[PDB]
């Protein structure tokens, strides 16, 4: 499938480039992810983005701190509206931090997963007939482990005290988020719960040019840890590495690769603070954050295709095995001391092997 989205051909190398893309055009002849739900645990979403409307569920906001959520109370509430995670001053978050505009990171990531495709608008997405379940866990200066842990539980169909039962348990969780430290019991237990319910958990390796073993949830057991490659098919300057990294997806090499080649392109906003301070747009972002949702979406394509053939969905361990075994070996040599898994996720190869 060559979809008709106006910016797809020029911008979205990460979908269709022969060295650095995930073989999406061929995959899309087989599956678009229909009937699957991917939970995006992130900064929230702009739910009326014209290129997302139709592929989103209401979701929920798990941030239990008014200052972080920019909401009026510390309550968790239905919906996942991103209120903006901007920070006006240097050093507000940690000693050393610098002021940043609102990321709309969750809307970008959600676009990689399920941006409306072949609709003659904006950009394409990978699992563009799936639904995204947005689960807002990050706000101003980030979020809290307890919020993220309960979000994992709820997203995967587990019970959380204080939140109504999830009517849309997700086959796949994407966490384009993390921080320093080995995986603790809190993360690991929530993740083990999701896995026990059949949910595959896909996470960003991190962007510290460091061993993924030193970060969480990257270093958690049972997860798919995703490094980042360039348009060239080689390691990005920022990607974390190590034996824990399972495979890579396109994350974008940044300025060395230019515009558009250095960035992944999806739905977002130019708003600097509140949603109202800007308008809907398409944004180019780089990171393991962008790589992870390509892999989460491919998982969704696989689960969907199987259901369509009346076959059983893959258990998490099988999904991770399939993603690794079917990845495209890197077209550029990866240095021995910075491994980033078995290859670049290959949407077509994954589908072909699952349907054999
Ligand atoms: B990514 O953008 O590549 C990245 C991956 C992560 C595993 C290191 N995600 C983040 O940095 C997320 C989302 C984000 C929010 C705002 C600006 C840019 C990105 N954030 C976090 O995980 C986070 C944020 N603040 C504190 C701690 N962690
Ligand atoms: Ca589109």
Numbering used by the authors: 1 to 356
Quote the study that presented this structure, word for word:
Through the COVID-19 pandemic it gained more prominence by being a key pathogen in respiratory co-infections. StmPr1 is a member of the subtilases family defined by Siezen & Leunissen et al.. It shows the main structural and functional elements of the family, such as a reactive triad consisting of Asp42, His105, and Ser28922. The catalytic triad consisting of Asp42, His105, and Ser289 is located on top of β1 (Asp42), α4 (His105), and α10 (Ser289).
Bortezomib is a proteasome inhibitor, using a boronic acid residue to reversibly bind at the active serine of serine proteases. Instead of 1.8 M ammonium sulfate, 0.1 M Tris, and a pH of 8, we used 0.9 M ammonium sulfate, 0.4 M lithium sulfate, and 0.1 M sodium citrate at pH 6. The phenylalanine is located in the P2 site, while the pyrazinoic acid occupies P3.
